[PDB]
Amino acid sequence: KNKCVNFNFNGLTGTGVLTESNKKFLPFQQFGRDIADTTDAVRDPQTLEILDITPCSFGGVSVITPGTNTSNQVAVLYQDVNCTEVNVFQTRAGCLIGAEHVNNSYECDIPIGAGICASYQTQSIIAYTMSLGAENSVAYSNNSIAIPTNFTISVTTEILP
């Protein structure tokens, strides 16, 4: 169980992972299908055991890399999986190999996913939760005000196609 094997249950060949669930088979049915009408669950020919056919794990592989004129260290990223059967830390988006997790929050330079970003600071790729901005407590009161006494005429630049 829990392995990507080539199952063979009464001629039903294929490749899948034998997992357990709460699905209870009917005494006349021998196999179950998903919405794609494929091999989704098989029945144990020896006893009353329900073994669902789970497809094996796959996902996209991304590389967190800085600029060429900055550094050359990289990290391996895996999507929508955990660090179970894939120096190595678990993030909210997936399993990351090659980066360390830092509890301190910084500015998002290179995004990872699910509120996690990465950056190169003095000298390795670190994983951290991104910050949404600096803390600014407004001094609210019944008569307190902040009227500007000095102004700066700054010119902004906007580029639109």
Partner: protein
């Protein structure tokens, strides 16, 4: 196929790689074992007769 540092240069088609996250390839678990479980045997078939 050497390292993920040079793997980013193949999917980008550029020597100078800027900062960011780039998708290079995909992984997949390969099958190793095979399940050939079947019920037990009670007797022998009379094919010799």
């Amino acid at each position: 196929a050497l390292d993920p540092l040079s793997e980013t240069k193949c999917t980008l088609k550029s020597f100078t790689v800027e900062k960011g996250i780039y998708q290079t390839s995909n992984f997949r678990v390969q099958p190793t074992e095979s399940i050939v479980r079947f019920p037990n045997i009670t007797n022998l078939c009379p094919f010799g007769e």
